[PDB]
C-alpha cells in the first residue's frame, strides 16, 4: 500500500519521461533532415555556379585575347 | 561580323535557407518538462 | 529496509540520469541553432554573390559586344 | 604585343554533400524501440 | 517475490532504455560532426571562390578599360 | 571618351565557419556518463 505505491510512483514518471524522450529523438531527427536537405541543395547550387562561371571565364578569356591581338595589329599598321 | 558573346545567365542559381526553429525550441521545452518527470520518493 | 532501499536505488539513478538527458537536449538544441545560423548566413552570402556576379556579367557582356562591333567596323574600313 | 589575359581556373572548387541518412533513420528507430522499454506494472 | 519482482521489472527496462538513449546520443553527435565538416568545407569553397573571382574581375576590369581607351584613341585619329 | 567599366567589388562577401565541437564532444561524454546511472539491483 505504502511501499507498494512507491513502486507505482517510479512507473508513472519513467513512462511519462520516455514519452518526452521519444519526442525529443524524432524532433532531433527532423531537424537533422532539414539541415541535410538545405546543406546539400546549397552545395548543388555552388557547384552549378562554378560550372557556369568556369564556362563564362573561358569565353571572356578567349574574346579578350582575340580583341587584344586584333587591336595590336591595327595599332601596328 | 563578330557574333554576340552570349554568356550564360546565372541569375536562377539560388541558395535556400533552413528553418528548424520549431525543433530547436521544442528541445529546450522537453528538457524543462523532464523536471516534473523527476521522482519525489517521500 | 532492504527492499525499501531497493526502491531508493532506482530513484537516485533515474534522477541523476534525467539530469544528464536534460543537458544532452539543450546541448543538441544549441548545436542545431549554431548550424542553422551558419547555414543561413552562407546561403545569404551565396545569394548576394550571385546578384553581384549577374550584374557584372551583364556589364562585361555589353562592353565586349560593343568592343567587337567597334573593332569590326574599324577593320572593315 | 599584348600578353595573354591568363585568368585563374576556378573549376577545381567543389562543394561537398553530406550523408547523415543512417543517423536520421536510426534516431527514429531508437524512438520506436523505447516502446518496449516501457513498464507494465501489473 | 511478487512486489520484490516489481522492483526487478523497473530495473530491466530502465537499463535497456538507457542503452538506447546512449546510442541515440552518440548517433546525434556523429550526425552533428558530419554536418559541421561539410558546412565548413563548403564555406571554405565559397571563400576560395570569392578570392579567385575578385582576382579575375580585377584583371577583366583593367583589360576592358585599356581596350576602351585604346579603341577611343584609334577612332579619334 | 568611354567611361570606366566600374564592376562591383565582391571581395567583402564571406562565408562563416561553424564551431560546435564543444557540443559534439559533450554528447559523447554524457553518453559515457550514463553508465554510472545504470542500476545494480543486488
From Swiss-Prot, chains B, D, F:
Effect upon mutating residue 7 to F: In strain: Isolate Frankfurt 1 and Isolate FRA
Recorded superkingdom: Viruses
Positions glycosylated per UniProt: 14, 35
UniProt lineage: Viruses, Riboviria, Orthornavirae, Pisuviricota, Pisoniviricetes
Name this protein carries in UniProt: Spike protein S2'
Role of this protein: Acts as a viral fusion peptide which is unmasked following S2 cleavage occurring upon virus endocytosis.
Coiled-coil residue windows: 16-42
Region Heptad repeat 2, residue ranges: 4-42
Known outcome of mutating residue 22 to E: In strain: Isolate GD03 and Isolate SZ3
Amino acid at each position: 500500500n505504502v511501499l507498494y505505491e512507491n513502486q507505482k510512483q517510479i512507473a508513472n514518471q519513467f513512462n511519462k519521461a520516455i514519452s518526452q524522450i521519444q519526442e525529443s529523438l524524432t524532433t532531433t531527427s527532423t531537424a537533422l533532415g532539414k539541415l541535410q536537405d538545405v546543406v546539400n541543395q546549397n552545395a548543388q547550387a555552388l557547384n552549378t555556379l562554378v560550372k557556369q562561371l568556369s564556362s563564362n571565364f573561358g569565353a571572356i578569356s578567349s574574346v579578350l585575347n582575340d580583341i587584344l591581338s586584333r587591336l595590336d595589329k591595327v595599332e601596328a599598321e | 561580323t563578330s557574333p554576340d558573346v552570349d554568356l550564360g545567365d546565372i541569375s536562377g542559381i539560388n541558395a535556400s535557407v533552413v528553418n528548424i526553429q520549431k525543433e530547436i525550441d521544442r528541445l529546450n521545452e522537453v528538457a524543462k518538462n523532464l523536471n516534473e518527470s523527476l521522482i519525489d520518493l517521500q
